[PDB]
RNA sequence: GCCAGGGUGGCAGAGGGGCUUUGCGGCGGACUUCAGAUCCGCUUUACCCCGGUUCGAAUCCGGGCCCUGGC
């Protein structure tokens, strides 16, 4: 709550220590679901793949290369231009762009159409033989809200969709038609086009880079390869060039990610678009790998590849100068920097159910169902505990005073007792607390047997009696409204969180199940709260 | 050069001043092409599209949304599952994937399609978490989408970037959408927002939730377009319909706001034509600064010996003050030994009544607006000299080097007399200057010109013995 | 080199294969010191302190807190206004600013002091906005602070960075503090947090709000220190007392959490000693990778003519297969004309019964753990060759260049016979190799050694006519 | 790419032409109970995809995929 500067000034200027202690009045009295960890700030997290890509950008930029956006969808003629004869082996691992043709509402299905009863469902409206013809000339997607809402009455698509379903079965006879258009299998396919336009109009050396998507089929499997990927590629254009220039770049690039040693072996593929004996494979050593489970125990892994475009293909695009090309595979680099073994799980985690919630996050989701709504209620419970704590080993029966005050303009007195005998006021589980450890929600008592669950887990700070207390306080508070005069709430044994007034939104519950987690919150609480409201 | 601490250290205690003044001895002696701005560092430059993408990422993260990679390649059955019946229409603007059958030619289509917008993949993703993770769920993603919009280019491209997000909570409303749009767009300079219900009422959005967001950006008021009032449609959003959500077992409402990058980028970096922004390379937009073109203008033949420099150097020093005396006349410029024998440098004009040097000996080469001019530092040309980048290379300056390095050719040739003269200047060549063929083709392509002309009229004779 | 499209373009239609194979003609022919890794790019590297600072900024921004520059130089009256009576103590750990009076020597102090922690400036800042801007106010700042802690260095430095923030709302509690500490620390890898009330109960914090936050970081479990259990005190926080707030007219409570950067940084980049982290330069921590040292090992004398290369090149080709034949014996390596006249290259060993080449002609120079070794590629040295960076320069390889470039000296000297022999190798020198004096002083400083030795025993005679 | 054993429900793993395990766990309810156990009811009666044999297949045969003792 807010205070007054003047006041606190003129009280501090004289009796400091008194002002100081008087500060506590400005703090707020948080209820149960207003305390840590029940409350917390949130922040968004980056996806590893994208994160890596951003680093790559900086890394390239940091070594003189300038960003660019190469052509993604291209005519396979380009591939054929870049691989000469072997161009076939490639285009088979590539995807072609097919598209749905328009439902010819004439000739084929016009003769055998105007021989029967065209339309029946009262729609009339002058023959849209023309408006439905513009569909063969040029239409779109949101054009369905054009030949209905503004044609044969009926707003937007209240009847636009079905009038197409129950009157025209032609739409269910469409099949995509292939084309000469494709989706690049690697940044290189697009480099030739881009370089063609500037390889001689800009000052040398020319250093360009681009980190974009590419597509490729591979046994149509995910556990063997991926349909779409990312390539952090670059091209170096200069008069004189040698594999050295390719090694240098590689080093200077990978060096910003940790790798400390590189080795370059020749690639047996000897691809056509690369000058013979230049297509190098680059192996780099990174610590994070050394002494691992993966096939990269020794620390080395093939991280990128590079070569010098064959003067053959350069000509196919009128490029006079030699060009160097290095290509890093993003996903892998990502996997390394962020520790992931399986590509698929790394990039598409949600789908592969690799979701998780740390202990602290579960703890935060464990709330208190029944909570006092009045400034009085809280004290009632706070005390109900206050007494239940002190008098814990008092042979039953017996009784003790908890709270004596006014609630809603009606004097009230609450008590904590026990009906049975030959025992103690409260069960041997009243002092147990809810702690979250290794994904499970436990209802344990502080003991040298449970240390591991308090020095590695995250205690909710709520104990059976705490949760219960708040429950009762509500009951008595409810009666102070039901105008009753004697409510005696009781709690015997605990099987779950309900028998403690604690709950967790459904999703978190399901999370725990989906992860094979367990909620072991049992025990003999045994406690009753007799409150006389007048 | 590397000096000795002590020397200067002790040499300092004696007479400091003279010691300090001595320092100039460690400074390097630079040849013509080793001087600024014919020398300089370089540095990569990023693309406005990508830059904007990143800006978008931080923007989204800056407001709680966590990143996710959504499925890009999917079976059209998904689109069908999402657009109920109106799906047939949608599949027209989408592409399909076709492969080549293994000949033991003609591509074979498949049920596979590339997502048109992000929303197609969202449901796929949300299905695995909407019921397990704690609410509210806030996810975003900025990736590629493909669309066959009329199948052209003049209006739009086949591939674009979507800056999408989705909010998953028990209670949602068109309001949460507006809220996000603001927080997002504000971080980019937008100041005022207006929302209007989208007419197309796409079926995947709870009827009447689909909205179109309009934002006000001061950078647009007074723009060379209708966006002059400052407003522009920047993003659209809605709440997914229980129908589609149900298809994937998603129990709670979902707010989805998605904005088109290419547009923001153009706005942010001031581009009028999308294509000319993202694919500048192709649409011939390459550009070099005057400073860059400057750096590219270099001397062709420079004195190799340390003597040659101090030779041509003087060659100039003379013609600077004696470019007046009427000819015939003569002035000795330099006298010294090079490689092995004494030599004298002469500068004159054998012609009758006139001047030693042409009226253009002191013209400086400077670049401006893409052109390489050759002009005299006159109050007339001022602007050019105060808004362009002057090479610092004057006609004499450039010629002298050719001269000095020329006697040098005779020196190691055994000769004893060299005639190096120069009349007219019809290009850089005639002045011992050049630019790489690629920059030439550049200026050419940029329809820029090189007006390097003028009567130099300057002769130089040297005799070795 | 720059080729012609057409040529290759047409030359391709004929026989592709032979055209492709032709390509190798455009590749450059590199001399020794132009080869990898004696050539390579470089790139700036950032400091862990600063890096961490930035990481902190985004962290704070990532959770709503806006940046602010707080007053650094202030009058001690402020400290007094804040610490009520306990202020006298505080002013001891703080510095004061003293100037030099203008002599129409002895510095004169003033009431001016440098802030010890961020909190000193916060009140100053908050005073102007706590009542005007809308609540909740969230501000943060990561800047320098100065403290005279015992006035030493072994324990702490005089200047450190504070990653501070302040939260201003109507209702606050020790809870909001814990909340922020988590959100902040989580983004850095911390996973579990524990809070304990601070004993010093500083007066500027509402009595009993001042807390000390402990965080768990897996990167610490198993650390070479007591932080082995994984926990560490990372930040402290509290709620300002109405007393101090009142001194500046601030009506509402304020939560202040502040963490020490230097510590986080050490944790993040794995440093044990603060000073050795932030001031590595001074505490001699300079370091170079084996790869870097490699790049620095270069040939001293390389054949200048294109012929010299293909000459020494052969010189090696021979001794590769004929380093066996017992001497005296002889093998012709090269025969050709250079600069003007034919020449023949000979390789032998005038000595009695022995071998043409020493047993160490084929030893490769490689770097490893900071040392420059010279060793034969034997299963024994393997590791060195598979964990260090091999120069690719072998004894012969390095010698031959000296030879070839040596006949070259005689060629333009008019001679007709040159004796270039080599017995022992007691360093890089004897093998035509060198490293810049600064890298030498480096290895020296890093107490690293250079074991480049071995019996080369190789002679080469050449005769020109 | 190649010899072969095999590809069952939320988890494990028996059988084998159509009727059919079981245990764990879970879902709901019952308890004079002061401690983490007790009882009763419970699911989609589960066994990849395309063909073949058959009255009938998850259990028989061919092809496409997936784990493994292996080349």
Swiss-Prot record, chains B, C:
One of its GO terms (biological process) is tRNA aminoacylation. One of its GO terms (molecular function) is ATP binding. Keywords: Aminoacyl-tRNA synthetase, ATP-binding, Ligase, Nucleotide-binding, Protein biosynthesis. Changing residue 354 to V: Shows higher activity than the E418N/E420N mutant with both suppressor tRNA(Opal) and tRNA(Amber), and the activity with tRNA(Opal) and tRNA(Amber) is almost 30% of that of the wild-type SepRS with tRNA(Cys). The keyword Aminoacyl-tRNA synthetase applies. It is an enzyme of class 6 (ligase). PROSITE patterns: AA_TRNA_LIGASE_II. Substrate binds at residues 117-119, 162-164, 204-205, 256. InterPro entries: aa-tRNA-synth_II, aa-tRNA-synth_II/BPL/LPL, O-Pseryl-tRNA(Cys)_ligase, Phenylalanyl-tRNA_Synthase, SepRS_C. It comes from the Archaea. Its EC number is 6.1.1.27. It catalyses: tRNA(Cys) + O-phospho-L-serine + ATP = O-phospho-L-seryl-tRNA(Cys) + AMP + diphosphate. Catalyzes the attachment of O-phosphoserine (Sep) to tRNA(Cys). Belongs to the class-II aminoacyl-tRNA synthetase family. O-phosphoseryl-tRNA(Cys) synthetase subfamily. HAMAP family: Sep_tRNA_synth (MF_01674). Homotetramer. Interacts with SepCysS. This is O-phosphoserine--tRNA(Cys) ligase. The gene is sepS.
């Amino acid at each position: 709550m807010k205070f007054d500067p003047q006041k606190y000034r003129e009280l501090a200027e004289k009796d400091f220590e008194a002002a100081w202690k008087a500060g506590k009045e400005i703090l707020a009295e948080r209820s149960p679901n207003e305390l840590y960890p029940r409350v917390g700030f949130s922040f968004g997290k980056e996806h590893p793949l994208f994160a890596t890509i951003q680093r790559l950008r900086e890394a390239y930029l940091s070594i003189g290369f300038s960003e660019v956006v190469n052509p993604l969808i291209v005519e396979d003629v380009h591939v054929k231009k870049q691989f000469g004869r072997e161009a076939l082996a490639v285009l088979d691992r590539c995807f072609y762009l097919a598209t749905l043709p328009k439902p010819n509402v004439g000739i084929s299905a016009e003769k055998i159409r105007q021989i029967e009863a065209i339309t029946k469902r009262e729609v009339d409206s002058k023959p849209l033989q023309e408006i439905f013809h513009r569909y063969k000339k040029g239409e779109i997607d949101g054009d369905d809200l054009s030949y209905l809402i503004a044609e044969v009455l009926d707003v937007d698509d209240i009847t636009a969709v079905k009038i197409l379903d129950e009157v025209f079965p032609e739409f269910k006879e469409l099949k995509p038609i292939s084309s000469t258009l494709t989706l690049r299998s690697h940044m290189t396919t697009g480099w030739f086009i881009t370089l063609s336009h500037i390889a001689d109009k800009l000052p040398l050396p020319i250093k360009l880079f681009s980190i974009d998507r590419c597509f490729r089929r591979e046994q149509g499997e995910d556990a063997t390869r991926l349909y779409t990927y990312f390539s952090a590629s670059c091209v170096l254009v200069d008069e004189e060039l040698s594999v050295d220039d390719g090694k240098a770049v590689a080093e200077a690039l990978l060096r910003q990610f940790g790798f400390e040693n590189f080795r370059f072996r020749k690639d047996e593929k000897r691809s056509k678009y690369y000058i013979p004996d230049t297509q190098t494979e680059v192996f780099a050593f990174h610590p994070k790998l050394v002494g691992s489970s993966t096939k990269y125990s020794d620390g080395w892994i093939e991280i990128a590849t590079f070569g010098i475009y064959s003067p053959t293909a350069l000509a196919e695009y009128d490029i006079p100068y030699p060009v160097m090309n290095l290509g890093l595979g993003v996903e892998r680099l990502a996997m390394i920097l962020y520790g992931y073994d399986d590509v698929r799980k790394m990039v598409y985690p949600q789908i592969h159910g690799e979701i998780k919630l740390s202990d602290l996050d579960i703890a935060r989701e464990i709330k208190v169902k029944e909570v006092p709504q009045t400034a009085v209620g809280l004290k009632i419970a706070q005390s109900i505990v206050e007494t239940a704590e002190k008098h814990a080993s008092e042979p039953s029966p017996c009784s003790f005073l908890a709270f004596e005050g006014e609630m809603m303009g009606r004097n009230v007195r609450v008590y904590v007792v026990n009906e049975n005998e030959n025992t103690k006021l409260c069960g041997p589980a009243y002092a147990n607390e809810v702690v979250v450890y290794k994904g499970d929600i436990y209802g344990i008592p502080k003991t040298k047997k449970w240390r591991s669950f308090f020095e590695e887990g995250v205690p909710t700070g709520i104990r059976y009696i705490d949760g219960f207390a708040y429950y009762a306080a509500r009951k008595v508070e409810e009666a102070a409204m039901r105008e009753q005069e004697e409510v005696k709430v009781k709690a015997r044994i605990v099987e779950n969180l309900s028998d403690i007034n604690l709950y967790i939104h459904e999703n978190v519950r399901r999370y725990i199940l989906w992860k094979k987690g367990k909620i072991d919150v049992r025990g003999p609480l045994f406690v009753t709260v007799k409150a006389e409201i007048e």
